[PDB]
């Protein structure tokens, strides 16, 4: 029905990614709530409660039951345009939607770029230490 690239704009898709989420009925950060706030579940071996905004790509772990996902998105990525979106998906114009997808594309790049920056800085630390070790006797 709708191309895979665009499915994450749909709340029902986002919700579906929460296959094994621990925080269910009783909790403030339910899948319905997480999804409403724009989060995709994308857990690791390392942090199995991992969640990402599909739009600004901010990643957040260490979720607690009383966490309101919207308050958390606001706190941790205040500049995310998805937060400004008041209309429902079906009410958007194609122009508005396309304006949004372009912003997301740019956000993805900025995130990829910032990751590469971090990896480069890590590689640079290893190199520095190795050289210091060899400078010794």
């Amino acid at each position: 029905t709708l191309p895979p690239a665009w499915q994450p704009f749909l709340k029902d898709h986002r919700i579906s990614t929460f296959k094994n989420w621990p925080f269910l009925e009783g909790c403030a950060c339910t899948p319905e709530r997480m999804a409403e706030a724009g989060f995709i579940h994308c857990p690791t071996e390392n942090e199995p409660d991992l969640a990402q905004c599909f739009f600004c790509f901010k990643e957040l772990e260490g979720w607690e039951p009383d966490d309101d996902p919207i308050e958390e998105h606001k706190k941790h990525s205040s500049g995310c345009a998805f937060l400004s979106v008041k209309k429902q998906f079906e009410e958007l114009t194609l122009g508005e939607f396309l304006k949004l997808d372009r912003e997301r594309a740019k956000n993805k790049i900025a995130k990829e770029t910032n990751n590469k920056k971090k990896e480069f800085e890590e590689t640079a630390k290893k190199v520095r230490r190795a050289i210091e070790q060899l400078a010794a006797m």
Binding site: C29, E47, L50, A51, K58, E59, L60, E61, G62, W63, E64, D67, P69, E72, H76, K118
Partner: peptide
Amino acid sequence: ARTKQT
């Protein structure tokens, strides 16, 4: 919740 760490 909190920013993923590396």
